[PDB]
Amino acid sequence: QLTTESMPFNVAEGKEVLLLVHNLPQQLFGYSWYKGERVDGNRQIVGYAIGTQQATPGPANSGRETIYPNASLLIQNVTQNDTGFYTLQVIKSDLVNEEATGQFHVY
Amino acid sequence: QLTTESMPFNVAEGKEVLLLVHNLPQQLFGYSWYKGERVDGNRQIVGYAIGTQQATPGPANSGRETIYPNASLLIQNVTQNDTGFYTLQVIKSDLVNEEATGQFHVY
Protein backbone atom coordinates (compact mmCIF):
# COMPACT_ATOMS: atom_id res chain seq x y z
CA GLN A 1 0.00 0.00 0.00
CA LEU A 2 2.88 2.35 0.81
CA THR A 3 3.65 4.75 -2.04
CA THR A 4 5.59 7.97 -2.51
CA GLU A 5 5.04 10.81 -4.96
CA SER A 6 7.10 13.79 -6.08
CA MET A 7 5.82 17.35 -5.79
CA PRO A 8 6.72 18.75 -8.16
CA PHE A 9 7.98 15.75 -10.13
CA ASN A 10 10.04 17.82 -12.52
CA VAL A 11 12.11 20.23 -10.43
CA ALA A 12 13.99 23.38 -11.37
CA GLU A 13 17.55 23.29 -10.03
CA GLY A 14 17.69 25.80 -7.19
CA LYS A 15 14.41 25.47 -5.33
CA GLU A 16 12.77 22.59 -3.47
CA VAL A 17 11.09 19.23 -4.09
CA LEU A 18 8.66 17.36 -1.83
CA LEU A 19 8.52 13.57 -1.67
CA LEU A 20 5.14 12.88 -0.08
CA VAL A 21 4.51 9.66 1.82
CA HIS A 22 1.13 7.98 1.36
CA ASN A 23 -0.53 5.00 3.03
CA LEU A 24 1.65 4.88 6.13
CA PRO A 25 1.34 1.61 8.05
CA GLN A 26 0.29 1.42 11.65
CA GLN A 27 2.45 0.56 14.64
CA LEU A 28 5.59 2.51 13.72
CA PHE A 29 9.04 3.10 15.22
CA GLY A 30 10.78 5.38 12.75
CA TYR A 31 11.87 6.04 9.18
CA SER A 32 14.93 5.68 6.99
CA TRP A 33 15.62 7.40 3.68
CA TYR A 34 18.17 6.19 1.15
CA LYS A 35 19.56 7.63 -2.09
CA GLY A 36 18.97 5.00 -4.77
CA GLU A 37 16.49 2.26 -5.62
CA ARG A 38 17.39 -0.11 -2.80
CA VAL A 39 17.79 -0.02 0.97
CA ASP A 40 21.47 0.62 1.70
CA GLY A 41 22.79 2.12 4.93
CA ASN A 42 25.86 3.20 2.95
CA ARG A 43 23.64 5.55 0.96
CA GLN A 44 21.35 6.50 3.84
CA ILE A 45 20.20 10.12 3.78
CA VAL A 46 18.51 10.37 7.16
CA GLY A 47 17.14 8.23 9.99
CA TYR A 48 14.26 9.60 12.06
CA ALA A 49 12.79 8.09 15.23
CA ILE A 50 9.14 8.94 15.95
CA GLY A 51 9.31 8.49 19.72
CA THR A 52 12.46 10.53 20.18
CA GLN A 53 11.36 12.88 17.39
CA GLN A 54 14.98 13.48 16.40
CA ALA A 55 16.55 12.67 13.04
CA THR A 56 20.08 11.43 12.35
CA PRO A 57 21.96 12.17 9.12
CA GLY A 58 23.30 9.22 7.14
CA PRO A 59 26.37 9.04 4.85
CA ALA A 60 24.50 10.58 1.89
CA ASN A 61 23.09 13.53 3.87
CA SER A 62 23.78 16.84 2.11
CA GLY A 63 22.22 19.09 4.76
CA ARG A 64 19.47 19.99 2.31
CA GLU A 65 17.07 17.30 3.55
CA THR A 66 14.37 18.26 6.04
CA ILE A 67 12.35 15.24 7.15
CA TYR A 68 8.72 15.40 8.31
CA PRO A 69 6.93 13.38 11.05
CA ASN A 70 4.86 11.66 8.32
CA ALA A 71 8.16 10.45 6.80
CA SER A 72 7.82 13.01 4.00
CA LEU A 73 11.16 14.15 2.61
CA LEU A 74 11.86 17.73 1.58
CA ILE A 75 14.93 18.66 -0.44
CA GLN A 76 15.66 22.39 -0.72
CA ASN A 77 17.97 23.86 -3.36
CA VAL A 78 17.94 20.83 -5.62
CA THR A 79 21.20 19.94 -7.37
CA GLN A 80 21.54 18.02 -10.64
CA ASN A 81 23.24 15.40 -8.46
CA ASP A 82 20.19 15.21 -6.20
CA THR A 83 18.37 13.69 -9.17
CA GLY A 84 17.37 10.04 -9.37
CA PHE A 85 15.65 7.55 -7.09
CA TYR A 86 14.86 7.83 -3.37
CA THR A 87 13.92 4.90 -1.11
CA LEU A 88 11.99 5.11 2.16
CA GLN A 89 11.89 2.34 4.73
CA VAL A 90 9.11 2.41 7.32
CA ILE A 91 10.17 0.43 10.40
CA LYS A 92 7.13 -1.21 11.98
CA SER A 93 7.14 -2.24 15.63
CA ASP A 94 7.04 -5.93 14.69
CA LEU A 95 10.20 -5.48 12.58
CA VAL A 96 8.25 -6.54 9.49
CA ASN A 97 9.20 -3.40 7.60
CA GLU A 98 7.91 -1.71 4.45
CA GLU A 99 9.78 0.14 1.71
CA ALA A 100 8.66 2.48 -1.07
CA THR A 101 10.65 4.10 -3.89
CA GLY A 102 10.22 7.42 -5.71
CA GLN A 103 12.11 9.78 -8.02
CA PHE A 104 12.29 13.32 -9.41
CA HIS A 105 14.02 15.01 -12.36
CA VAL A 106 16.25 18.09 -12.17
CA TYR A 107 17.02 20.68 -14.85
CA GLN B 1 31.65 -2.87 10.55
CA LEU B 2 28.70 -5.15 11.38
CA THR B 3 29.63 -8.42 9.73
CA THR B 4 28.39 -11.97 9.56
CA GLU B 5 29.90 -15.29 8.55
CA SER B 6 28.46 -18.70 7.79
CA MET B 7 29.62 -21.53 10.03
CA PRO B 8 30.29 -23.68 8.30
CA PHE B 9 30.43 -22.13 4.83
CA ASN B 10 30.36 -25.58 3.25
CA VAL B 11 27.28 -27.39 4.55
CA ALA B 12 26.28 -31.03 4.14
CA GLU B 13 22.82 -31.54 2.63
CA GLY B 14 20.52 -32.10 5.59
CA LYS B 15 22.82 -30.77 8.29
CA GLU B 16 22.87 -27.36 9.97
CA VAL B 17 24.43 -23.91 9.49
CA LEU B 18 24.83 -20.84 11.72
CA LEU B 19 25.24 -17.25 10.60
CA LEU B 20 27.26 -15.69 13.43
CA VAL B 21 26.48 -12.03 14.00
CA HIS B 22 29.19 -10.01 15.74
CA ASN B 23 30.41 -6.40 15.73
CA LEU B 24 26.85 -5.64 16.81
CA PRO B 25 26.44 -1.87 17.35
CA GLN B 26 25.06 -0.86 20.76
CA GLN B 27 21.70 0.94 21.06
CA LEU B 28 19.43 -1.25 18.93
CA PHE B 29 15.79 -1.84 18.12
CA GLY B 30 15.70 -5.28 16.60
CA TYR B 31 16.67 -7.48 13.68
CA SER B 32 15.41 -8.52 10.27
CA TRP B 33 16.66 -11.47 8.25
CA TYR B 34 15.97 -11.61 4.52
CA LYS B 35 16.61 -14.34 1.94
CA GLY B 36 18.70 -12.78 -0.84
CA GLU B 37 21.40 -10.11 -0.96
CA ARG B 38 18.92 -7.23 -0.68
CA VAL B 39 16.58 -6.03 2.06
CA ASP B 40 13.10 -6.77 0.73
CA GLY B 41 9.90 -7.16 2.76
CA ASN B 42 8.66 -10.23 0.88
CA ARG B 43 11.85 -12.24 1.11
CA GLN B 44 11.91 -11.52 4.85
CA ILE B 45 12.61 -14.54 7.04
CA VAL B 46 12.17 -13.13 10.55
CA GLY B 47 11.66 -9.87 12.42
CA TYR B 48 12.61 -9.61 16.08
CA ALA B 49 11.96 -6.76 18.55
CA ILE B 50 14.53 -6.98 21.34
CA GLY B 51 12.35 -5.22 23.92
CA THR B 52 9.08 -6.96 23.20
CA GLN B 53 11.15 -10.13 22.81
CA GLN B 54 8.63 -10.94 20.03
CA ALA B 55 9.78 -12.83 16.92
CA THR B 56 7.48 -12.53 13.90
CA PRO B 57 7.98 -14.93 10.96
CA GLY B 58 8.14 -13.46 7.45
CA PRO B 59 6.86 -14.73 4.09
CA ALA B 60 10.23 -16.40 3.51
CA ASN B 61 9.96 -18.38 6.73
CA SER B 62 10.25 -22.13 6.18
CA GLY B 63 10.15 -23.04 9.87
CA ARG B 64 13.76 -24.20 9.81
CA GLU B 65 15.32 -20.90 10.86
CA THR B 66 15.79 -19.63 14.41
CA ILE B 67 16.95 -16.13 15.33
CA TYR B 68 18.85 -15.50 18.57
CA PRO B 69 19.12 -12.45 20.89
CA ASN B 70 22.71 -12.04 19.68
CA ALA B 71 21.10 -11.54 16.23
CA SER B 72 22.55 -14.85 14.98
CA LEU B 73 20.50 -17.02 12.62
CA LEU B 74 20.57 -20.83 12.54
CA ILE B 75 19.10 -22.92 9.70
CA GLN B 76 18.35 -26.63 10.13
CA ASN B 77 17.56 -29.44 7.65
CA VAL B 78 19.33 -27.45 4.95
CA THR B 79 18.38 -28.37 1.36
CA GLN B 80 20.66 -27.69 -1.60
CA ASN B 81 18.37 -24.98 -2.96
CA ASP B 82 19.19 -22.76 0.03
CA THR B 83 22.64 -22.22 -1.49
CA GLY B 84 22.81 -18.43 -1.73
CA PHE B 85 22.84 -15.12 0.13
CA TYR B 86 21.11 -13.99 3.32
CA THR B 87 20.81 -10.38 4.49
CA LEU B 88 20.56 -9.22 8.10
CA GLN B 89 19.36 -5.71 8.82
CA VAL B 90 20.21 -4.31 12.24
CA ILE B 91 17.79 -1.52 13.17
CA LYS B 92 19.39 1.18 15.32
CA SER B 93 17.31 3.44 17.53
CA ASP B 94 18.50 6.52 15.67
CA LEU B 95 17.03 4.67 12.67
CA VAL B 96 20.36 4.75 10.81
CA ASN B 97 20.34 1.06 9.96
CA GLU B 98 23.24 -1.33 9.38
CA GLU B 99 23.18 -4.36 7.09
CA ALA B 100 25.35 -7.45 6.70
CA THR B 101 24.99 -10.24 4.13
CA GLY B 102 25.86 -13.90 4.67
CA GLN B 103 26.60 -16.73 2.27
CA PHE B 104 26.40 -20.52 2.56
CA HIS B 105 26.53 -23.49 0.17
CA VAL B 106 25.20 -27.08 0.27
CA TYR B 107 27.11 -30.01 -1.30
Side-chain angles (χ1 to χ4, degrees), chain B residues 44-98:
Chain B
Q44 169 149 23
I45 304 181
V46 65
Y48 173 77
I50 81 185
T52 298
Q53 294 320 334
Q54 198 192 337
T56 299
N61 196 266
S62 55
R64 300 178 304 168
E65 319 86 354
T66 300
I67 191 175
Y68 292 89
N70 47 42
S72 298
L73 179 60
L74 173 141
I75 301 175
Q76 297 182 285
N77 280 330
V78 175
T79 188
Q80 192 139 7
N81 297 284
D82 314 311
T83 297
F85 299 88
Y86 288 68
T87 301
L88 158 73
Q89 187 186 28
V90 164
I91 307 295
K92 299 237 235 178
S93 91
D94 53 37
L95 269 301
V96 173
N97 307 314
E98 299 188 7

Side-chain angles (χ1 to χ4, degrees), chain A residues 29-32 34 38-41 44 47-49 56-57 89 91 93-97 99, chain B residues 29-32 34 38-41 44 47-49 56 89 91-97 99:
Chain A
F29 185 43
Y31 315 111
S32 305
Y34 308 91
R38 328 179 316 169
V39 177
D40 192 343
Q44 188 165 8
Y48 179 70
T56 313
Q89 178 156 325
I91 310 295
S93 60
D94 59 323
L95 262 308
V96 187
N97 312 326
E99 33 267 19
Chain B
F29 201 55
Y31 316 125
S32 289
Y34 306 86
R38 311 192 334 172
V39 169
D40 181 28
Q44 169 149 23
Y48 173 77
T56 299
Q89 187 186 28
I91 307 295
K92 299 237 235 178
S93 91
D94 53 37
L95 269 301
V96 173
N97 307 314
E99 303 149 31

